[PDB]
């Protein structure tokens, strides 16, 4: 439980509380030069996190990067926070466009189950993944920086593009 709890908090403290307040302005700026205002975070419960979303689903195609968000942190000058805009295809048709990405800490949990000295059983990978999401949901429920700007897509495995499309058309 400790590992998932910490990663969820590091995900919020290190990433979400920093970019969510500035997310809306960045999205408007791209729209000015080209529900979609929300960050959609994929949470595969099996911790399978491909680095390329297109490999996960051909209907998910990279479109363009958002304007970069930079800031000095932990002695590193101009640390860059960037997000990628994806389009969702349905029967060859362009069904939507949104900022889509996986939750990277799930990728860390997968690796811990592989490395021996981590002492992390592969069975616990699913367990800590569930705890990570539930902890993340609780943080964002009371998070002030999150006001209709972040949605979590939790799933266990099918069409990944359809799953994201379901949440887009749901609201």
Ligand X SMILES: Nc1ncnc2c1ncn2[C@@H]1O[C@@H]2COP(=O)(O)O[C@@H]3[C@@H](COP(=O)(O)O[C@H]2[C@H]1F)C[C@@H](n1cnc2c(=O)nc[nH]c21)[C@@H]3O
Of ligand X, its own copies, none, which one sits near residue 156, judging by CB under 5 to 8 A according to partner kind? none
Q: What is the dihedral of CA 163, 171, 107, 25, to 10 degrees?
A: 140
Interface region with its own copies, contact rule CB under 8 A, candidates 27-35, 88-96, 100-108, 145-153: 100-108
Determine if 108 is a binding residue for ligand X (CB under 6 A).
yes
CA distance 154 to 42: 6
CB of 81 to ligand X, least distance (A): 4
Q: Whose Cβ is closer to its own copies: residue 24's or residue 108's?
A: 108
Of ligand X, its own copies, none, which one sits near residue 15, judging by CB under 5 to 8 A according to partner kind? ligand X
Q: Tell me the per-residue interface mask from 49 to 88 with ligand X, x by CB under 6 A, - otherwise.
A: ---------------------------x--xxx-------
User: Can you list the alpha helix ranges (DSSP code H) found in 48-159?
Assistant: 53-56, 104-114, 123-142
CA distance 19 to 15: 6
Determine if 14 is a binding residue for its own copies (CB under 8 A).
yes
Nearest residue to ligand X on Cβ basis: 14
Of its own copies, ligand X, none, which one sits near residue 52, judging by CB under 5 to 8 A according to partner kind? its own copies
Determine if 15 is a binding residue for ligand X (CB under 6 A).
yes
In contact, 47 and 125? CB cutoff 8 Å: yes
Q: If 0-12 CB within 10 Å is exposed, 13-18 middle and 19+ buried, where does residue 47 land?
A: buried
Q: Whose Cβ is closer to ligand X: residue 76's or residue 141's?
A: 76
In contact, 44 and 108? CB cutoff 8 Å: no
Angle between helix 104-114 and 123-142 (nearest 10): 160
φ, ψ of residue 55 in degrees (nearest 5): -65, -35
Which residue ranges make up the site for ligand X (CB under 6 A)?
10-11, 14-15, 76, 79-81, 104-105, 108
């Amino acid at each position: 439980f400790n590992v998932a709890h910490g990663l969820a908090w590091s995900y919020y403290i290190g990433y979400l509380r920093l970019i969510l307040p500035e997310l809306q302005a960045r999205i408007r700026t791209y729209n000015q030069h080209y529900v979609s205002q929300r960050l959609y975070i994929l949470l595969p419960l099996d911790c399978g996190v491909p680095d390329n979303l297109s490999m996960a689903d051909p209907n998910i195609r990279f479109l363009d990067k958002l304007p970069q968000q930079t800031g000095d942190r932990a002695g590193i000058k101009d640390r860059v926070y960037s997000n990628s805009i994806y389009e969702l295809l349905e029967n060859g048709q362009r069904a939507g466009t949104c900022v889509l990405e996986y939750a990277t800490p799930l990728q860390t949990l997968f690796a811990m189950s592989q490395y021996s000295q981590a002492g992390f059983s592969r069975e616990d990978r699913l367990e800590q993944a569930k705890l990570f999401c539930r902890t993340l949901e609780d943080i964002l429920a009371d998070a002030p920086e999150s006001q209709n700007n972040c949605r979590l897509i939790a799933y266990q495995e099918f069409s990944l593009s359809q799953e994201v499309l379901r949440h887009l058309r749901q609201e």
